[PDB]
Structure formats: C-alpha cells, structure tokens
C-alpha cells in the first residue's frame, strides 16, 4: 500500500486501483465521470444509474442509495478503498469503515481540486486531472469576460428544493463557490450566514428579492411532494419575487443531481450561469 494525503489526513491504499466503492460521495461519481474511472461500487439513484453516469457504471454494482450504504454489499466487494462523504453521520462513517479503508470526500466546494486529485492519485490519472483543472481555470478566465458588468453586480441565488422545501447553502458549498467566488457575484447575507445546508422560507426569500434564481429540483428528492415546483410557482409570495416577475428563474440549468463542488459541476454551472445571466446562448 501507498501513503495518500487528502485534506491533512493520510491513508494507506493499494494504488493504482480500480477496486473503488463510492457511497454518499456523488462528488466522486462526478470526478470519476471526467477522469473515466469505472468504479467497482457506485451510488444508485432510485435504484438506477442515471444516463449521465452510464459510461462509468458499466463495471459497477450499486453501493446503495446516496445516504443509505448497503454495508453487506460493500463487504461483498472487498474494495481497496471506499470513497465516502463528509456529509454522513459520524456513526455511519464508522460502520462503512468496517468494509474497508474509508475516505470521507469533502462536500465543501472549495475542495474540488483536492477531491479530483484524490481520485486521480488512487487511479494513476494525475496528468488527466491536472489537465481538467487547468481547462476549468482557462474556461473561467474566458467566461468572466463574456458576462456583462451589470450581471456581475446583480443579486443571484441558487436554491434546491428537497421534500418540497427550499434550501440554500453556504458561500463555499454547492454551486455558490462558482457563482460568488469564481464569477465574483456578491453572496446575499442569508448565504453568508448559512452554516450548512439551510432551510429558507419563501417569506424570507421575498425579502431578499433576488434578481436571478437558479432553482434545482430533482424528482427523486421530492417523491413526498412531486408538484412542489408548480405549487411554488402558483404561490402569491413566490410571484412577488423580482426574479419571477423578470423571467429570471432558471430551473435545472444543470442536472439537478449535480453537487456543485466538482470540476464537472463547476464547468457546467459556469456555462449555465453565463448563458442565463446574459440571456444569450453565445456565452
């Protein structure tokens, strides 16, 4: 085994390997997609592998739904390494670790490079990861120039609807690191004040009154409230929003299962935000 450093922690893992089981870390699925890593175990979404991942799940068995690792299945696999998530309860990470060397992959989007390089070190694809990272940075440089100065001064928010409720995220979490950090838009105080994924009322949103709203809605994450979006859209308080009246609401401009803090999420969000904020596909 070889010493792998990841966010001031060291793990001994047999590398390079393909015996990788991914549970909870949708981030690592997105890194696997761009690195062309075909893991032994991957996350299922309502019992299937989404079309967007089918090119890297061809060799994989499901580890379970994102939040619900099947420890018996993961044991069955005897992976060289398990890519878990920092979003699991600690007790659940401990249980996962009974099936093998377990690395909790960070959901903090500012760690996107470290996450990619982790998977790259595990699979011998450092050169490929660095090229991907370099290409994002070049894309960011070019894209920033294509977005008008008024757009860059607007009040923009990313929300995700889960079980029919509205969630915001910290400045360095989800897509916010790209929207505020990379593109330079100003994070609303409610985002600055968020300590983690945080429920926001439609009432509070109406006071924030953003100019632009990116709404992410996965049917899979709203099985309890399937019409949540149409219901929202008919609400008088939602209808009072500046963004809603100006037709500046962008629903699923990136696939709603996208996690935000990955190369792939960032490049997709960079382009979507460019198009939507400038209201022109040329961006």
């Amino acid at each position: 085994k070889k010493k792998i450093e990841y966010l001031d922690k060291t793990y001994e893992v047999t590398v390079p390997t393909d015996k990788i089981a991914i549970t909870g870390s949708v981030e690592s699925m997105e890194d696997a997609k761009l690195l062309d890593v075909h893991p032994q175990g991957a996350i299922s979404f309502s019992g299937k592998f989404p079309d967007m991942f089918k090119d890297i799940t061809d060799k994989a068995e499901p580890t379970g739904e994102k939040m619900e690792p099947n420890i018996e299945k993961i044991l069955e696999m005897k992976p060289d390494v398990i890519l878990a998530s920092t979003k699991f309860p600690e007790k659940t990470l401990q249980k996962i670790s009974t099936a093998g060397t377990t690395i909790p992959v960070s959901h903090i989007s500012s760690n996107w490079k470290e996450n990619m390089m982790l998977l790259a070190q595990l699979t011998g694809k450092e050169k490929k990861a660095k090229k991907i990272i370099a290409d994002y940075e070049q894309d960011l440089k070019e894209t920033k120039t294509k977005i008008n100065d008024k757009a860059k001064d607007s009040k923009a928010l990313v929300i995700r609807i889960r079980q029919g409720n509205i969630y915001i995220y910290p400045e360095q979490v989800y897509f916010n690191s790209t929207l505020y950090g990379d593109l330079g838009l100003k994070a609303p105080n409610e985002v600055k004040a968020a300590k983690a994924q945080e429920l926001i009322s439609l009432e509070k949103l109406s006071e924030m009154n953003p100019d632009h709203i990116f709404v992410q809605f996965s049917d899979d994450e709203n099985a309890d409230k399937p019409d949540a979006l149409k219901d929202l859209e008919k609400n008088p308080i939602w209808k009072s929003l500046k963004a809603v009246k100006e037709d500046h609401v962008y629903v699923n401009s990136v696939d709603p299962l996208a996690q935000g803090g990955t190369a792939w999420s960032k490049v997709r969000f960079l382009k979507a935000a460019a198009e939507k904020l400038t209201q022109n596909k040329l961006a």
């Binding site: 920092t86 979003k87 699991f88 659940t92 983690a196 994924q197």
Partner: peptide, 6 residues
C-alpha cells in the same frame, strides 16, 4: 442524512 437537509 445528518451536511446537517438534516
């Protein structure tokens, strides 16, 4: 599933 929407 607590990164808390829990």
């Amino acid at each position: 599933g607590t990164g808390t929407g829990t």
